[PDB]
């Protein structure tokens, strides 16, 4: 693609807290999170079933980056999302993905046994993005513009010069 | 059984209802299952209820 250009969209998440950060990702002195990801926790006693739709009406492809949260315990899972088994379903006209989070521990890193699985979805012009979840969703704040062209990546330690 | 001297290609499918009421209205039990196996392999698909865009 050769670009990180991010377009922030208007996703409206109701009955659910946004912006939730952690100690393992820090911005400034306080807690923080992935800048392009929105971590949603419950509000009150309830985390509602979320059904939302984001149409792509533009003439270019959209790349949405999202995630799924894996708690290291049932007490964390339920403490955050209410229902003890979460679900995330991301579908367009041409495809769908359904991920059901893995509770339990995988070996510690950065002080946490809980992780995130990252997934991407491409939305073509005239197609809509649809997002549906009962819990365990790290939502997109928008998309990345997709370009076609000569850009690439290379692994090197060589210094750069003028 | 395939008793012939040539390979057979079987095409089949799984039905995804847009509702539990359609699923149960059609198939009785609210969670369906399909398992297709030969000696050398197997596939097991459990249908996705719910809506994908019209
Ligand atoms: C990453 O880049 C995004 C896209 O912009 C650009 O990309 C970069 C790399 C460069 O190439 C730039 O030259 C290029 O423009 C940034 O998104 C931008 O964010 C700003 C600030 O929030 C948005 O400004 C607002 O635009 C509103 C509508 O604009 C219309 O036209 C644009 C431009 O083509 C379209 O994208 C839109 O869809 C609209 O059709 C406008 O109404 C707003 O005015 C109101 O708000 C201001 C306060 O911000 C207020 O003063 C005023 O009274 C109004 O109430 C506002 O101007 C801008 O739309 C948006 N650009 C795009 C292309 O989406 C993004 O910020 C950047 N990321 C970071 C973190 O820097
Ligand atoms: C299945 O087995 C695995 C391995 O035994 C287990 O996961 C492991 O959990 C332990 C802790 O229970 C992890 O060890 C950590 O190491 C860090 C780094 O130094 C420590 O800081 C951690 O200890 C903290 O908490 C302790 C208890 O209060 C304090 O004594 C300590 O000072 C710290 O505050 C912690 O011990 C270990 O890293 C993982 N295993 C792996 C391979 O990473 C898991 O819990 C077991 N699951 C079940 C179902 O029992
Ligand atoms: C999660 O959200 C999605 C999107 O909101 C939703 O799926 C959508 O269902 C609507 C209808 O409920 C679909 O829109 C259809 O568009 C056709 C084509 O023109 C209409 O003909 C359909 O309307 C018929 O039925 C209506 C109700 O009686 C009548 O008013 C109308 O005249 C027609 O008879 C229908 O509105 C839409 O296409 C999908 N979404 C997408 C992206 O395709 C889904 O139901 C939501 N799920 C949950 C759990 O709530």
Curated annotation (Swiss-Prot), chain A:
At the top level, the lineage of the source is Viruses
Q: Which residues are glycosylated?
A: 51
The protein here is known as Hemagglutinin HA1 chain
Task: Show which stretch of the intact protein is covered.
Answer: 131 to 292 of 566
Swiss-Prot record, chain B:
The protein's name: Hemagglutinin HA1 chain
What is the species listed in this Swiss-Prot or TrEMBL entry? Answer: Influenza A virus (strain A/Hong Kong/1/1968 H3N2)
Q: Which stretch of the full-length chain is present here?
A: 185 to 238 of 566
């Amino acid at each position: 693609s050769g670009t990180l250009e991010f377009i922030t969209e208007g996703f409206t998440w109701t009955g659910v807290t946004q912006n939730g950060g952690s100690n393992a990702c820090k911005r400034g002195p306080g807690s923080g999170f992935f800048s392009r990801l929105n971590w949603l926790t419950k509000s009150g006693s309830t985390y509602p079933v979320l059904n939302v739709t984001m149409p792509n009406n533009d003439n270019f492809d959209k790349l949405y980056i999202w995630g799924v949260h894996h708690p290291s315990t049932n007490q964390e899972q339920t403490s955050l999302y209410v229902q003890a088994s979460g679900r995330v379903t991301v579908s367009t006209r041409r495809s769908q993905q359904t991920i059901i989070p893995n509770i339990g521990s995988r070996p510690w890193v950065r002080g946490l046994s809980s992780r995130i699985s990252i997934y991407w979805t491409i939305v073509k012009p005239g197609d809509v993005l649809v997002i549906n979840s009962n819990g365990n969703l790290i939502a997109p704040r928008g998309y990345f513009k997709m370009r076609t062209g000569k850009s690439s990546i290379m692994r090197s330690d060589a210094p750069i010069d003028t």
